[PDB]
Amino acid sequence: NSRQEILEGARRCFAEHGYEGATVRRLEEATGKSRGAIFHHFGDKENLFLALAREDAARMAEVVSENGLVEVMRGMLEDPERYDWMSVRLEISKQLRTDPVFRAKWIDHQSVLDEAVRVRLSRNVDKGQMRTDVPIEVLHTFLETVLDGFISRLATGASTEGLSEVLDLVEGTVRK
């Protein structure tokens, strides 16, 4: 409960203020919980952020298991209210490249999504639905690159125009 309350409020706070602007005082205000309770549950601000990213990964992993990364992207188009949170995620990009400890933690906190993508694509291969003239890992990297592009695009304020059709094309490309 307390943990949940902290996560729901923290997501709002980060989205509203950005990473640096999500001060401890603002996190208190957004959660109704003390700094002592927040850090008791999460240790530090970065771990709190990582918990949120892991929540994202779990949710995305579920959708992937149903209908792939393309369906995650379709959901992005349905959810414009989430763009502010997507922007916060993007702010940690440089740290991801330069801080080995944080990097490893970020990767670990995405592990459920990464595996789900792999399982999905395996299932698709088993069913003979993917093209076989291109290795499955090239197809994998292609889908991940489109996903990163979608996130960037939307977060930076590009319109929705033609994106559903772009997703149709993306799906068509990896199929037989």
Q: Nearest approach, Cβ of 173 to Mg ion (angstroms)?
A: 11
Query: What 3-state class would DSSP assign to 99?
Result: coil
Which of a second copy, Na ion, Mg ion, none interacts with 46 (beta carbon under 5 to 8 A by kind)? none
Q: Is 36 in the site for a second copy (CB under 8 A)?
A: no
Q: How far apart are CA 75 and CA 35, in angstroms?
A: 34
Contacts of residue 28, defined as CB under 8 A and 6 or more positions apart, other chains included, come to: 34, 35, 38
The per-type count for the chain, helices as H runs and strands as E runs, is: 10, 0
Is 175 within 8 Å of 130 (Cβ atoms)? yes
Amino acid at 168: D
Residues 92-121 interacting with Na ion (rule: CB under 5 A): 116, 119-120
- The stretch among 58-66, 86-94, 105-113, 126-134 that binds Na ion (CB under 5 A) is 58-66
The DSSP annotation for 35-56 comes to HHHHHHHHSSHHHHHHHHHHHH
When binding is defined by CB under 5 A, the residue of 14, 64, 68, 72 that contacts Mg ion is 68
When binding is defined by CB under 5 A, the residue of 15, 22, 69, 70 that contacts Mg ion is 70
Residues 56-95 interacting with a second copy (rule: CB under 8 A): 83-84, 86-91, 93-94
Q: Is 125 in the site for Na ion (CB under 5 A)?
A: no
When binding is defined by CB under 8 A, the residue of 13, 152, 175, 176 that contacts a second copy is 152
Q: Is 146 in the site for a second copy (CB under 8 A)?
A: yes
Query: What 3-state class would DSSP assign to 1?
Result: coil
Q: What are phi and psi of 130, to 5 degrees?
A: -90, 150
Take residue 14 and report the two structure tokens written for it.
């980060």
Q: For binding to a second copy (CB under 8 A), which residues are involved? A: 18, 20, 83-84, 86-91, 93-94, 96-98, 103, 134-135, 137-139, 141-142, 144-153, 155-157, 161-163, 165-166, 169-170, 173
Can you say which residues are annotated as belonging to the binding site for Mg(2+)? 171
Residues in touch with Mg ion (CB under 5 A): 68, 70, 171
